[PDB]
Amino acid sequence: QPFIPPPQQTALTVNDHDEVTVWNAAPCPMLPRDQVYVRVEAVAINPSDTSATPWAFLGTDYAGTVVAVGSDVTHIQVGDRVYGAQNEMCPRTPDQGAFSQYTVTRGRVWAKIPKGLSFEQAAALPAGISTAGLAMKLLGLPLPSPSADQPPTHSKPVYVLVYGGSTATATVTMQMLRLSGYIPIATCSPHNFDLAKSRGAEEVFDYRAPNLAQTIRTYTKNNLRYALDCITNVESTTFCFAAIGRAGGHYVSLNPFPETRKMVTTDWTLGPTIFGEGSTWPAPYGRPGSEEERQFGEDLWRIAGQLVEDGRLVHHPLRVVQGGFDHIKQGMELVRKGELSGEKLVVRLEGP
Ligand SMILES: NC(=O)c1ccc[n+]([C@@H]2O[C@H](COP(=O)([O-])OP(=O)(O)OC[C@H]3O[C@@H](n4cnc5c(N)ncnc54)[C@H](OP(=O)(O)O)[C@@H]3O)[C@@H](O)[C@H]2O)c1
């Protein structure tokens, strides 16, 4: 009954000459006493996968079948299905990444898949849930209550601009914003208008429209105080700053931002902080680990896991590919080239 990991496996990594590589003799991680061992069934592709520690495993989003259980783990059994996030390309843990045949759960940044979800649907969620939570925390917005019967009331609407309303992150975030009593207003391309509205946007606009920031300022009564930038380029930053109200506001982006007097505070989400383990980027010093960041991730996942279970948080629309590891490599290229719109690339792994 003791579990012994396989001697080697296939995983996706980067080699010594900056090329994405299928490695067929990759190591298998050891099983922590407080984690479970996962035979990965599906993975999702994220832009951050495509942005190096050679030979460390790639990939964030996984869903799979529990094949072994740590001695200190309760409430999980062999055969259970789980989904969660890995901390990709981490030099201290190069044998942990979503793009492997076998991984281990990390922290408490995971949950059991609800009976009603498939592996493919569940794999689509982890980075979205994680990022949505970090963005709400940085904006100074409370996470939803999983136990409440309706959102908090605001007789005077509290708007949140979401620049890039068709992004995988925005569609999960806008649902959470709604649950917490906020009213998201989104910008994206016309063909994704229905998607954005279905995911919680009160109104949606084409970001290309002339003088759109004036339109938004007027809509929000010149008091927009929250802007979430899911695109993070020179144009999106300029736009969000122009839309924020006359008295100031808070800009949060999902990436570090390029190079005002506008009374705007600023932050950006650092993905590895969902684990509270720290980060070696950005130099100098990166970030330390912290128990408060760790506890926030666990709390977020306990809340989001229930919301997913209850059908209150739905996955981004899926583009599913049946395949193996070369299909992940291929998926990453489609994503890197900006070739996906309003969909998440998920690969369902064939064994063998
Ligand atoms: N730091 C982190 O841990 C972290 C986590 C999650 C995401 N991110 C970052 O957030 C960004 C979005 O990632 P995601 O996975 O949420 O989204 P995604 O699904 O890859 O977003 C794709 C959408 O972005 C829109 N888009 C692309 N370029 C645009 C531009 N120049 N102006 C306006 N819209 C543009 C398009 O929407 P339309 O076709 O509708 O125009 C496209 O469909 C990426 O840069 C990613 O690196 C970072």
Nearest Cα neighbor of 201 from 254, 159, 243 is 159
**Is ligand 1 within 6 A of the CB of residue 96?**
no
Scan for tokens 């012994």, then name that residue: 4
Q: Determine the distance separating the centroid of ligand 1 and the alpha carbon of 47, expressed in angstroms.
A: 8
Q: Determine the distance separating the centroid of ligand 1 and the alpha carbon of 164, expressed in angstroms.
A: 7
* CB 94, CB 26: distance < 8 Å: no
Of 61, 125, 230, 345, the one to substitute when testing ligand 1's pocket (max ligand atoms within 8 A of C-beta) is 230
Q: Which residues lie below 8 Å from residue 15, measured CB to CB, with a gap of 6+?
A: 21, 54, 55
Amino acid found at 64: G
Ordered by where they begin, the domains of the chain are 1-124+315-352 (3.90.180.10), 125-314 (3.40.50.720)
Q: Determine the distance separating the centroid of ligand 1 and the alpha carbon of 335, expressed in angstroms.
A: 10
| Pairing assessment for the beta strands 226-229 and 249-253 based on DSSP bridges | parallel
* CB 265, CB 240: distance < 8 Å: no
Rounded-to-integer distance, Cα 227 and Cα 222, Å: 13
Q: Which atom of ligand 1 is nearest to the CA of 236?
A: 32
Residue 127 token pair: 């980075």
Rounded-to-integer distance, Cα 77 and Cα 116, Å: 18
Burial label for 199, CB within 10 Å (0-12, 13-18, 19+), is buried
Q: Determine the distance separating the centroid of ligand 1 and the alpha carbon of 257, expressed in angstroms.
A: 14
Of 43, 49, 167, 191, the one to substitute when testing ligand 1's pocket (max ligand atoms within 8 A of C-beta) is 167
Q: Determine the distance separating the centroid of ligand 1 and the alpha carbon of 285, expressed in angstroms.
A: 27
Using alpha carbons, list the distances in angstroms from residue 251 to 72, 214, 316: 41, 17, 24
Residue with CA nearest ligand 1 atom 46: 47
Q: Determine the distance separating the centroid of ligand 1 and the alpha carbon of 171, expressed in angstroms.
A: 11
**Is ligand 1 within 6 A of the CB of residue 46?**
yes
Residue with CA nearest ligand 1 atom 44: 47
Rounded-to-integer distance, Cα 52 and Cα 57, Å: 10
* CB 223, CB 245: distance < 8 Å: yes
**Is ligand 1 within 6 A of the CB of residue 192?**
yes
Residue with CA nearest ligand 1 atom 39: 341
Sequence-ordered alpha helix ranges (H) in 233-321: 234-243, 291-309
